[PDB]
Design a protein around this ligand. Structure first.
Ligand SMILES: NC(=O)c1ccc[n+]([C@@H]2O[C@H](COP(=O)([O-])OP(=O)(O)OC[C@H]3O[C@@H](n4cnc5c(N)ncnc54)[C@H](O)[C@@H]3O)[C@@H](O)[C@H]2O)c1
Ligand SMILES: NC(=O)c1ccc[n+]([C@@H]2O[C@H](COP(=O)([O-])OP(=O)(O)OC[C@H]3O[C@@H](n4cnc5c(N)ncnc54)[C@H](O)[C@@H]3O)[C@@H](O)[C@H]2O)c1
Ligand SMILES: NC(=O)c1ccc[n+]([C@@H]2O[C@H](COP(=O)([O-])OP(=O)(O)OC[C@H]3O[C@@H](n4cnc5c(N)ncnc54)[C@H](O)[C@@H]3O)[C@@H](O)[C@H]2O)c1
Ligand SMILES: NC(=O)c1ccc[n+]([C@@H]2O[C@H](COP(=O)([O-])OP(=O)(O)OC[C@H]3O[C@@H](n4cnc5c(N)ncnc54)[C@H](O)[C@@H]3O)[C@@H](O)[C@H]2O)c1
Ligand SMILES: O=C1N[C@@](c2ccc(N3CCOCC3)cc2)(c2ccsc2)CC(O)=C1Sc1ccccc1Cl
Ligand SMILES: O=C1N[C@@](c2ccc(N3CCOCC3)cc2)(c2ccsc2)CC(O)=C1Sc1ccccc1Cl
Ligand SMILES: O=C1N[C@@](c2ccc(N3CCOCC3)cc2)(c2ccsc2)CC(O)=C1Sc1ccccc1Cl
Ligand SMILES: O=C1N[C@@](c2ccc(N3CCOCC3)cc2)(c2ccsc2)CC(O)=C1Sc1ccccc1Cl
Lengths: 328, 331, 331, 331
């Protein structure tokens, strides 16, 4: 009688759970950039989008849904209720408080996490959490605390963007693609990030071997300025357009690729360092991690210099002082 | 010797011309969505970005540049000067003005013509052998404005047209039949937007015509009301603006799909705004969406679609309305 | 301590069960072409390869393993034992016997049935919730053999069928019209090979029916010889074997396109061999190609194609031709 | 009129030349693996295939052509005449002779030099601005033969070299450390094959040097036996030929990775055979693998690798060895 019945003959209507589902909590500039990066890389069969703002959330879901002809993602869902996030493999939290004062920004984000994290674990208890929101190093700890998930399943964006920006500026200087420009920025994400000058190489040849003054004050070519420009460019983007979207979105997708496909690639991501670099407190800092289907299965022990080790410990001390005064 | 000289031994420093360059004029919500869609599909070796707002332009260029580690595009450039657009294979114009509550349609068209009177001569100056891809609204009128100022042959002036209308229609057809929009073949033609004409005869799944099985398809006396599908296409477009304020992702992905066919010379059929003078009883220099074979030469060929008397009448009515504004335009 | 212990600090050693695993039974020209097509499309996290010839199997596994730097597939396994196939989501059977001089159709199919009497119980033993994708010839008969031995529901037993016939047809239609095969919509149904039925009504470009514009389409009395398009499909298949000895790339790419729809739950329509008992006056348990909606549950739905009396009779003839062999099978 | 005239209305009949053409000389196991790797990575708009064997060449061209529905490459051409190779951006030479039973190594070299005396002048005739990518063995000697006959600058004559050695090494390093070969940085330089030199100082994971926290790395005094990693690279290459008879997938994927950097001007570092004269105390016109920055101009730059006395002596021995054959060549 109906055209659907006339045209299509159904064999079975059985309901089945998505095998490769990804949830994005926060539909901001970052959240949407992560979403489009994932859809275009064909990492998910189902994409769930969650936010507090109901109108923007429906609009963003619809805009992605209209472009479904050019995407290999059959299902794109949204809602205020986390029942839409059910059976998700990876959950990306980009949800954060608006920077206007009037509790502080760190205190506001913890409260936001106080209802996201229990709601996500409720529908997706075997997922891997990917924290993007700032302070990423503190919030990854807050996520780990509330979820009660093992250390490995709580991954933080960390210094993935710092290293991506550093490899670009290293790339521009040497006139080589950032993929061939190997450089690692570790520790606390942002201003307090530690560039590992010993690790800096192109084709296996160490840049500190050829140039011993690399990352020092007596560097005539002043290579210490490369890491200075990383921090400066981050403040420049906010001054020029108001937000960072594409660079972070693409980085999150690169982590999502390693997790969803069990690639076992090394990435600079925020993880628990309790037992390494003389750190005894429950603090999360970026170190090179082997990322797969189990989250952080392994972490690379990087030989740091006395000054690098003192910087990571200073961060570990300043971070724990904040974390110990956090109420749940 | 410097570290670069110590580490790398240069064989040649011969600065060559980019073989697959794409310029995006307008760094708005649409422009940026097109940019990221192109970069992720690896369609260009060089991407040029142009806008009037200098601050936003530098910020957007830098944000894409930082993500270069995850992209296969070595060069991303920007600037107010069009010298950055030199030797482009494709130029996407997303530059436009925002209509006000106390503003006439003809005024808006003129404002966008004044914007185009600055862009089009500047683009042809540095890229005379490029293909123009117009996104700005009214697309059908602005593709004609671009064609007149550039003096480019009709094939090299392509307009987005009903590419998004069709994409939205195939999605809603897809969700109703429970099949992927790629397997849901449907064509929306003519004037982009409200006046768009859905071709019900062309509407099929696996080659089987939906009008054949259901003759009341698209008719006012339909039991299932398949007219609601095209009605929802227009309604959803107004809904997105009401809910978030702009459309970005859907259009950006569609522009990249056109760009893929142009940049790779695929010769796939797409519903794009082209010179319609000669067919369906149209005598005026009007641009309307018809299925076009898109390649390296732009619109090399166009598909002759058998339209019904009502569909053909809807096409003339739009051609008459578009020409009405077109004759009242200042160059 | 070891260098691995010195360099890397382990958090957990507990390995998870394969999530998106694909098994390829038969490491022949077809099997390897399927394997490389899947790996390059990044459809599997683990790829299992099975064959009777243990030497070639190890060599092929190693050759793919060496190229792992350029692939997004972390695990590539092989072995004579099917314990390597455990927890596979899709199993592609390309295992077959080679056609001999002075051999009966009943004789060749039974040699392949014996091969299947060993494979099918061994695959279900380790992967009971998988989807079987049959490639080996006669594909329409061996999909039925697979369905009977496995005891799997009709949806989980998919046969390659007329996916290659349609791909070849859309290419020849494409070359003639000077348009990309993706824009050239054509459906070849029924029994895969010589007895394949081209659906001339379904043949279109941009929704416009080629039978409508040209009523002589597919008839021997056509001056443009559009019936020669399907004749050239059969002729090219025999030509490839005459010129190189086997078909590999075309079939391999088609299998991956089916795999993409299954592994990603795309719900795209494909011409695949399925249990057609009940449709087009067919009463026997015969597998024939019809457009199917392919997803994570295998064949969830099938498209009811309006066939002409000549097309229906050809399909009915193939059903009788296949059942003649099927009822004579000892298994 | 015709169905093509009825369906498609032509705007222009302009003949189009390929912008991104790739030619593959040799349609063997390697040649075909390169071809399918390139097509699936969407690196070319036109693919040209040439070989001496006319039958196999037509069969292989047709098999790829049939799979065009699943590929983004509109044109696939073949022929004995090199007029089909005209205006190529990259030419991959996989054409070779196989060592006969009574034949010596020196006899095999001259036979390939004779094969090259016919190919290289014919390729430069139609594609004088192309980049040659030689795969055929001995790669280090035949890249020199190609460079001498073509008269092309050293940057436009690229040899596969140790790209496969490094890919195999990074896989075995990867398996040992339980990390993806992409995160396992290791460089094998010099003469491709048995005489290849592994750079133990360069060996790292996340920037941390493996020679630093394991000083016995690559020496006989090693308890863990990391010397065997490179010895297994050689062993596995001989194993693949013993088990299946040829190497195809691993090399084809590596060739496509080089092609990606050339065709897209990525400027990525790769271990490829280049004119080493003037470096590491080498005075002869010898080609050896060193890390090269690969772009649209071929080898624009080299990476100066700090080699140990034994590594540097190993490289100058291979350069003296290769020249011993090269001076005795007749062309
Ligand atoms: N880790 C990095 O390298 C990095 C880089 C860039 C940005 N960021 C961070 O990303 C975060 C967001 O950036 P943005 O540009 O998307 O900002 P935004 O303010 O536009 O996005 C925040 C979104 O979170 C939503 N939200 C608030 N409370 C929520 C809740 N309880 N549940 C769900 N959603 C909720 C808001 O509605 C808003 O859409 C910031 O904290 C920023 O610091 C991190
Ligand atoms: N054709 C379609 O289907 C379709 C779909 C969606 C949007 N659109 C159109 O896209 C256009 C832009 O949408 P948006 O969201 O990017 O809007 P927006 O207003 O944010 O973008 C317009 C941009 O153009 C720039 N611009 C203005 N004058 C310029 C000039 N002389 N040179 C260069 N740049 C200039 C502005 O600085 C601004 O960044 C609108 O006209 C809209 O109607 C078309
Ligand atoms: N359906 C189509 O459109 C289509 C197209 C092309 C080829 N094919 C079919 O694909 C099949 C194989 O083609 P090919 O080129 O790979 O031929 P082939 O003879 O080289 O491959 C057959 C492989 O199956 C293996 N095999 C045999 N018995 C086995 C067993 N019991 N378990 C596991 N493996 C076993 C053999 O060792 C051999 O490697 C043929 O039946 C051919 O007709 C089908
Ligand atoms: N560089 C590496 O790392 C590497 C790795 C693997 C293989 N190879 C080399 O690749 C080469 C070929 O391997 P294959 O498996 O393709 O072998 P094959 O013998 O099957 O292929 C050789 C092809 O070259 C063709 N040919 C011969 N003379 C020709 C001519 N004058 N013009 C055009 N084509 C001609 C032959 O017809 C044949 O098809 C060998 O030399 C092998 O050593 C190199
Ligand atoms: O984590 C980051 N946060 C950002 C950032 C700032 C504000 C907002 N919003 C304000 C407007 O509303 C939206 C949220 C969003 C993101 C940043 C830039 C300078 S300080 C912090 C953007 C950015 O670039 C990085 S990375 C970074 C930061 C500092 C130093 C070094 C690095 Cl790598
Ligand atoms: O061309 C379009 N234009 C849009 C549109 C784009 C930008 C802005 N800005 C104004 C505010 O500033 C930001 C830009 C406003 C509207 C539209 C939506 C309803 S009427 C026109 C968005 C859209 O979806 C289409 S396609 C379309 C439109 C109408 C009917 C049917 C279709 Cl398919
Ligand atoms: O199913 C097929 N089988 C093939 C085929 C035949 C023999 C072998 N060998 C196995 C390995 O040993 C050598 C022979 C492998 C494949 C074929 C070609 C002409 S008749 C059947 C190849 C092919 O192209 C199709 S599809 C097809 C066939 C006939 C008509 C139309 C179509 Cl679409
Ligand atoms: O260059 C190579 N050549 C191969 C090879 C390629 C083609 C053929 N034929 C093709 C079929 O006809 C017969 C000849 C025979 C051998 C090889 C294997 C052991 S010695 C040389 C295959 C291979 O794997 C490498 S790389 C390599 C070789 C030795 C040591 C280390 C490495 Cl990385």
């Amino acid at each position: 009688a109906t055209l659907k019945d006339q045209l299509i003959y159904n064999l079975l209507k059985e309901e089945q759970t998505p095998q490769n589902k990804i949830t994005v909590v926060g539909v901001g500039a970052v959240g949407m950039a992560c979403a489009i990066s994932i859809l275009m890389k064909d990492l998910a069969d189902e994409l769930a989008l969650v936010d507090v703002i109901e109108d923007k959330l429906k609009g963003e879901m619809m805009d992605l849904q209209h472009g479904s002809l050019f995407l290999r993602t059959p299902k794109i869902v949204s809602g205020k209720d986390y029942n839409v996030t059910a059976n998700s493999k990876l959950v990306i939290i980009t949800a954060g408080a608006r920077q206007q004062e009037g509790l502080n920004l760190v205190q506001r984000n913890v409260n936001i996490f106080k209802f996201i994290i229990p709601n996500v674990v409720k529908y997706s208890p075997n997922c891997k959490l990917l924290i993007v929101s700032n302070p990423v190093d503190i919030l990854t700890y807050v996520a780990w605390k509330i979820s009660g998930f093992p250390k490995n399943r709580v991954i933080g964006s960390g210094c993935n963007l710092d290293s991506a920006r550093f490899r670009y500026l290293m790339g521009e200087r040497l006139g080589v693609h950032p993929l061939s420009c190997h450089g690692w920025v570790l520790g606390e994400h942002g201003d307090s990030s530690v560039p590992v000058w010993s690790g800096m190489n192109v084709a296996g040849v160490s840049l500190k071997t050829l140039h011993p003054d690399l990352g020092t004050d007596k560097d005539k070519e002043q290579w210490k300025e490369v890491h200075k420009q990383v921090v400066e460019s981050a403040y420049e983007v906010i001054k020029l357009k108001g937000y960072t979207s594409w660079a972070i979105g693409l980085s999150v997708a690169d982590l999502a690729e390693s997790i969803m496909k069990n690639l076992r690639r090394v990435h600079p991501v925020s993880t628990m360092i309790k037992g390494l670099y003389g750190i005894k407190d429950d603090v999360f800092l970026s170190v090179p991690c082997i990322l797969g289907q189990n989250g952080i299965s392994d972490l690379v022990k990087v030989t740091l210099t006395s000054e690098e080790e003192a910087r990571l410990k200073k961060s570990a001390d300043t971070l724990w002082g904040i974390q110990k005064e956090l109420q749940f």
